[model samples]
Target: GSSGSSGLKCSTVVCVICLEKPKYRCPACRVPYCSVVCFRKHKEQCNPETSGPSSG
Candidate 1:
């Protein structure tokens, strides 16, 4: 989330396989969702392989 003009600049949302934060965020959406679980979840919407939108 952002405030005061900076805009909601979020980091990449990954699956957290490495248990680390998102290293690369989606250029399309300004949402930082990292971690393997998140990556897979996000992919569902971006890639769309039967899966649906993410919870976040």
Candidate 2:
């Protein structure tokens, strides 16, 4: 018997990048992520009227 673990547990209740933690919701689009790594790839894509880190 093929017991596939058909579990798509990836709901937005977790990080868009992780099953760990979506500790940041920076945009009204509900773009959920945080810290430098998320910004390491996604900078200008994050269109927020709020603040962005200068290190990136």
Q: So what's the TM-score on candidate 1?
A: 0.29
- lDDT (Cα, tens digit) per residue for candidate 2, span 1-56: 77868777764565455444756765554666655476445555755555676444
Residues 1-56, candidate 1, lDDT per residue (tens digit)? Answer: 86576666875443334445666655545445564466666656663223576755
Candidate lDDT values, in order: 0.52, 0.57
Deviation (Å) of 55 in candidate 1: 22
**What is the RMSD, in Å, between candidate 2 and the native fold over all Cα?**
10.7
Candidate topping TM-score: 2
Worst window of 10 by summed lDDT in candidate 1: 11-20
